[PDB]
Amino acid sequence: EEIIWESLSVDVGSQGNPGIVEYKGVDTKTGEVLFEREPIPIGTNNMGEFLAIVHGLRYLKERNSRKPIYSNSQTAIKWVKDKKAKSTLVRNEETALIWKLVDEAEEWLNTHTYETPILKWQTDKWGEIKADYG
DNA sequence: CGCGAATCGCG
DNA sequence: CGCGAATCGCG
Ligand SMILES: [Mg+2]
Numbered sequence A: 001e002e003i004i005w006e007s008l009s010v011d012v013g014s015q016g017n018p019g020i021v022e023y024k025g026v027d028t029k030t031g032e033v034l035f036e037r038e039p040i041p042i043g044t045n046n047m048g049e050f051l052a053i054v055h056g057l058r059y060l061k062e063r064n065s066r067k068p069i070y071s072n073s074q075t076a077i078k079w080v081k082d083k084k085a086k087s088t089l090v091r092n093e094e095t096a097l098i099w100k101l102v103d104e105a106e107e108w109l110n111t112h113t114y115e116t117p118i119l120k121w122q123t124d125k126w127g128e129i130k131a132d133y134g
Numbered sequence B, C: 001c002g003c004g005a006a007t008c009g010c011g
Helices: A045-062 A074-082 A096-111
Strands: A008-015 A019-027 A033-043 A069-071 A118-120
Touching (some): A008 A045, A019 A045, A033 A045, A045 A074
Parallel strands (some): A069 A118
Antiparallel strands (some): A008 A019, A019 A033
């Protein structure tokens, strides 16, 4: 399996798990940052990876782009394909924002179609995903 | 730590 | 029992 350079890659920057969550999507070839979500005060890394893929799908759909999305999160990929984020994070006032975003991203998936292939980034073969926060 | 995938205990 | 609830492998 080979890298598709004409693609978008996403990843999450965490400060703890659970902890602060941010994410971004970048051009796999050029590294150009295409979208970014500012820090969400608490979430899980998995929830962040899920939001990052869905944000990518919405971004690419708006632009009518047929580029695939790479994610290094097998869990988030499954959640998007299932249209269901199977997170165990407690729902309270502290976690209200991350859950609002996850709920909305699920709602988007259940009310839209998309052509974007969602591919697993193979870190062990290809090194770090381009959206890595380092 | 959170996930998906892969031994227990109660009815 | 045997099925549904309750450690492994990884990132
Ligand atoms: Mg990540």
